[PDB]
Write a protein that binds this ligand. Structure first.
Ligand SMILES: *[C@@H]1O[C@H](CO)[C@@H](O[C@@H]2O[C@H](CO)[C@@H](O)[C@H](O)[C@H]2NC(C)=O)[C@H](O)[C@H]1NC(C)=O
Ligand code: NAG
Ligand code: NAG
Ligand code: NAG
Ligand code: NAG
Ligand code: NAG
Ligand code: NAG
Ligand code: NAG
Ligand code: NAG
Ligand code: NAG
Ligand code: NAG
Ligand code: NAG
Lengths: 317, 169, 170, 316, 171, 316
């Protein structure tokens, strides 16, 4: 008698996958679902990239010499480096990380004058710690000094209204002198007090002059503070010394992504997911490369591999 | 293993069958012939691709750094950030392994199903002129030539043409 | 598509069949008659409703504001709150689209299954007095009247009453 | 001759998605993501307090606008954008934690702290809290030297929480607009306030000096707060610049607090709120507002996700 | 319910059948005999165990306290910690109830499937020498003895040995 | 003659849940949520240190209660509710972050900071840290002027972390109970302490003045801390009111820290702890405590979720 037989295909060496029900069941063809391949570069093709180099992101606001090329940049993608420094004259930013986070997503910054002018004080205090050609200072700030050494610094009030349509970023510094003598030399004697107010902000500051070790040959410190001024609100500063005034306000330009990286930039590859050691370029839904990747990333998972069957149960002889 | 076809009552697959997932091997007077079915091969492949296109999807969702690899953030908020990120890694890792296990179960059983749909269909074609032996074969109880096979293949084989013939047997 | 019935070897469905999901269309001497099966229609519907009641569930779980729409919270904790909330939106959105895709697969295959359970049952009833043509039909090999149909329907049709008759006719 | 079984079908069905295919038409399908907002606050059956011009934190200290809310009860507390915490300019330190506590409080019940005072004033007022002429925070006492420039004595006041539930305690530090003004109010010399309990310990120095005028005042008051556990004691010590609490607050029970821009409606029942209304729905998910609170469907990205309730639809 | 076997056209199960999930009850000349199938019982059990081993898994993942039961943390970070922990409890609870519902669906339908694989196989063995009555039984149309049963059981029953006999016996 | 196949069944099976129906009886089912607590801390095979009356932060500064814990080793650290960080009253600034570092430390190893001092006292004590008569924190030195009222010199001390792992550095600011007392201890005039490294920069001014007596002391000490990276240097500068560290701390390895109210048991093995004992289980989920730590089944709302291990049960 005659016969006809139907049947399915098979290959000699298939791949093991996992099921609800069994482990390492061989199938005909299977495909990988977890990204394991890194590109050891920052793939920036088609993106306005600013690599901050020796400039610290926070420096772009206040303007130490090493940030001179970055006072007014534009970017879709901002790259911080480990050598980056925010500061010439020793000091710190209060609430630095929140500020970095704002700046990373800013699209870059556009600077506008605060329109302050000053009577019967100095405006041009400098230091050998910010070297441009001889002593200088933060480019966006003014070190306000008594008219002569020891002189009384007047009670001052300066105010600024955000007339633009977007929120403004406002910085100022408090100077902590290396000695009490130095304070009174710069600003005259007596208690100093700085206040800063708006409709959503209210704080006051007293310098603490006195001895710190020398850092960059300075015993004083400057502490920067900041705030966002909403359209149509006004900042008011009041102060009788020890106050580092802003000369320019900063406006955020648009939208961007900020990353910290240790690797070269590459304008030839296209990527949207970044970490310190490169770019994750992939279509897969998951990745096991770096749990701290940012951008538009496959989700990070523990497992090194998860294979998705694309074939049937594979049966040989 | 859901339907019994693949790795069930069919003993195995054919490593010579390059041009399909499912097909036919026949034995009659003239010779022995093999050709793979298109309609059902296409069918399965299409369900697999439809799975893939769903996963090889890209999330349009952007995340930024809350964290700092160069100057560590203050320690308490650092610990909250880490605990949350670790908790998310648990959720995703569980989701990942589960999704893949489940899709695999279904892909395998998708295949059992389509085989056992080829079968049950051909069976239906042949009415009473043949028999289930049970290794994925039909013993035909009438002499038949290679143009009779093709008519089973492309689904034209008429039964009441060979009915009586195949019956006494 | 799992079982081969719906959108498989049955060619299509009947837009005239208002009173059920599954039913019968017959042709005999007297006339042509249609009536929908209750026992299996009920059966599927019940599995669908059982799906629904599971999802149309209400979470008894309360959440409060950690956030402030009127005076923004400080920016660092603001950013942690937002990043976490966005991470949960990812999880829930994935869960949502996954649950719905999967329930749908299953609902469709639930239906293929019940059809192909009506079939295989009627087939079993009729023993050897009829044949699978393969478009979801049984050619009966004996004359039969409209009270013979109803006995198939409500599951009383006796085979060894019409056996011999229908067998020579084969 | 024959009998044929078969399934039903409709002429225009709905597209859904499956594991396997996209836009597969089925007979009947149903929506699973809520898209419909009710542009009102649905408060039927709930004890509602809508704070209006009163700021939640005002309920504690008691500027004139909050006079009707010093001792309220609520299941549902509604903050408004016009709400103000303050008459005399100043801020709350740690305001958001305090809001969060207050939102879930079920309202507050006030008890006297039982302080009395010798050989100082107790009734300092300001034209910035207007009741009929100058007044002050209703729950606070502005403590002043007996006469202008006089020495304010070193004081200690302590309060024990003898009730069975934790007490909320407030006080303020006054930053005068000038040093002169400080010594006028409190006498000359360094001022120091300390506040101690078994789980709390902090000290405060005022910073007198020039601020712009806000509500015609150059000084500022800063409020601080703590929770006093049953049976614990707060102790304040101070030689001026100190705004004393007259009453402690106790939380009444349980409530929900929301911020809203829309009207209240006691006719509709809802348990999920956002600034723009109520989400009333049984569906598991919602695409209306990612910040909704209460008992809410989970928020998702997608505008729609249809659940098949029918079979494969195959027409002619 | 998927395949129609269990709680379908088989009316019920046998509370006397201690040594398996699936088996045989026969009636012939000699007597009535019951013995449970190994090959398919083993098969199902193995798929159940394979489910279990996947869940009775231990997470190698460590978590530490971010929280303090003895001196409460500051209230704002306390509230964020609580809100996140509550959000995770939502996710896990949903995942838990969903996983278990789904596995159960599948476990039940795994069983329907294996029954309806025993059936369809025995059916295939007997070719044309018997009939589907439809309550999970085969009426044999030839006399058969208890060594004929065993040969169906351990899968050796030859058809073309009893063919003719049972065929006229269907008319 | 006939043969019939069929499946098994039991007379009373268990209800489970499915995608599709609720309470469908199956032959055998199994539990998936842990409900069983072990009311003890299962520490078998683990180096356990149970801190008792010593507070975790005490192990750093060294009040008398913590004398046995200055240099411990552990895989598992157990805090108790009676634990106390402090002899002389005061607090740690940023205490919780410091607890969190200490809990996971593997214990601590102490190294001298190599400070020596000229023309001051080094040996200030207090009756609040009792060893045999007045004493002080064992790891700290209370620096005092040479005689009462004398000027305390402007000092600078610096320490370089030359080891290969990060060092924990602690110091305190003393706020005296009165201004007289400050000048008695440290001489008159303004006091300022600064603390610098490459990743740290802060300055501190004491606030002398009246606090209630706690343990018979009106002054307070506030401890502050930092991590010094290998090869970095801390520098302190100060002219009084400064409590100097004598020893830096190095983290030993890795550990788990838990807070508990129950006994230790070295007979049972567990890796998931909470305040009320150990969760010992293989199940993927648990309904015992949402705050468990270690390697734990995931916490869920539900009391029970049964996993079918049998088939659909249909009986006679
Ligand atoms: C507020 O309280 C003070 C302190 O008791 C009031 O008392 C006056 O004090 C003066 C001298 O300090 C005494 O001669 C009188 O006993 C008080 N005067 C009067 C008219 O009663 C003080 O008057 C109060 N101020 C206001 C505006 O009510
Ligand atoms: C195997 O799977 C991959 C991924 O889907 C596919 O690209 C490839 O074409 C497949 N190869 C074969 C031989 O089936
Ligand atoms: C800075 O400005 C002052 C005051 O106008 C001026 O007299 C002085 O010479 C300036 N110093 C330098 C170095 O330009
Ligand atoms: C902003 O505020 C000013 C003064 O407060 C008011 O007159 C007006 O409403 C606003 N002006 C503009 C240009 O937005
Ligand atoms: C948190 O985890 C990251 C990476 O997962 C680690 O590198 C970092 O040191 C950790 N931060 C803290 C504060 O423990
Ligand atoms: C966080 O996102 C919300 C919207 O969900 C936005 O309105 C808010 O301004 C954001 N907060 C911060 C701190 O960026
Ligand atoms: C379609 O689905 C809805 C939602 O479950 C159901 O209530 C309704 O009865 C169905 N409509 C029809 C016409 O069957
Ligand atoms: C309050 O304090 C006492 C004595 O210190 C303590 O023993 C007791 O538990 C407390 N009293 C009440 C009524 O709770
Ligand atoms: C957070 O929840 C815990 C219980 O999980 C509770 O005891 C604690 O008081 C809550 N903390 C805050 C800050 O609300
Ligand atoms: C502490 O040290 C000083 C400095 O030499 C010493 O003279 C003094 O007597 C000491 N005090 C005690 C109680 O040992
Ligand atoms: C630390 O830095 C110093 C700079 O004098 C250098 O000599 C040394 O190599 C460094 N030590 C280590 C252990 O890295
Ligand atoms: C359920 O009881 C069965 C039937 O006797 C037994 O085999 C099994 O041990 C139980 N289930 C589990 C998961 O142990």
């Amino acid at each position: 008698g005659d016969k006809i037989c139907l049947g399915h295909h098979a290959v000699s060496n298939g791949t093991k996958v996992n099921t609800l029900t069994e482990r390492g069941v061989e199938v005909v063809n299977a495909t990988e679902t977890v990204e394991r391949t890194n590109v050891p570069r920052i793939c920036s093709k088609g993106k306005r990239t600013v690599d901050l180099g020796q400039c610290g992101l926070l420096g772009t606001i206040t303007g130490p010499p090493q940030c001179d090329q970055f006072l007014e940049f534009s970017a879709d993608l901002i790259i911080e480096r480990r050598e980056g420094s925010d500061v010439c004259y020793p000091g710190k930013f209060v609430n630095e990380e929140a500020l970095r986070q704002i700046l990373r997503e800013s699209g870059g910054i556009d600077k506008e004058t605060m329109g302050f002018t000053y009577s019967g004080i100095r405006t041009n205090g400098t230091t050998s710690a910010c070297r441009r050609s001889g002593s200088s200072f933060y480019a966006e700030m003014k070190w306000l000094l008594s008219n002569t050494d020891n002189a009384a610094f007047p009670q001052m009030t300066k105010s600024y209204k955000n007339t633009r349509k977007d929120p403004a970023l406002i910085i100022w510094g408090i100077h902590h002198s290396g000695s009490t003598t130095e304070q009174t030399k710069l600003y005259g004697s007596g208690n100093k007090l700085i206040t800063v107010g708006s409709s959503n902000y209210q704080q006051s500051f007293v310098p603490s002059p006195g001895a710190r070790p020398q850092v960059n040959g300075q015993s004083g410190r400057i502490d920067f503070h900041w705030l966002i001024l909403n359209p149509n609100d006004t900042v008011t500063f009041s102060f009788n010394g020890a106050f580092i005034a802003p000369d320019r306000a900063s406006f955020l330009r648009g939208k961007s992504m900020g990353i910290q990286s240790e690797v070269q930039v590459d304008a030839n590859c296209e990527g949207d997911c970044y970490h310190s050691g490169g770019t994750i370029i992939s279509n897969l839904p998951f990745q096991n490369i770096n749990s701290r990747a940012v951008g538009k990333c496959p989700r990070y998972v523990k497992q090194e591999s998860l294979l998705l069957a694309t074939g049937m149960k594979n049966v040989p002889e | 293993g859901l339907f019994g076809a693949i790795a069930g009552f069919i003993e195995n697959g054919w490593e010579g069958l390059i041009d399909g997932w499912y097909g036919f091997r026949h034995q009659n007077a003239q010779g022995e012939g093999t050709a793979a079915d298109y309609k059902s091969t296409q069918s399965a492949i299409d369900q697999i691709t439809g799975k893939l296109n769903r996963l090889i999807e890209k999330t349009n969702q952007q995340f930024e750094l809350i964290d700092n690899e160069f100057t560590e953030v203050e320690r308490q908020i650092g610990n909250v950030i880490n605990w949350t990120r670790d908790s998310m890694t648990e959720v995703w890792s569980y989701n990942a392994e589960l999704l893949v296990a489940m899709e695999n179960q279904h892909t395998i059983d998708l295949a059992d199903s389509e085989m056992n749909k080829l079968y049950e269909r051909v069976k239906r074609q042949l009415r009473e002129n043949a028999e289930e032996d049970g290794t994925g074969c039909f013993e035909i109880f009438h002499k038949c030539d290679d143009d009779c096979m093709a008519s089973i293949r492309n689904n034209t084989y008429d039964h009441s043409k060979y009915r009586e013939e195949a019956i006494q047997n």
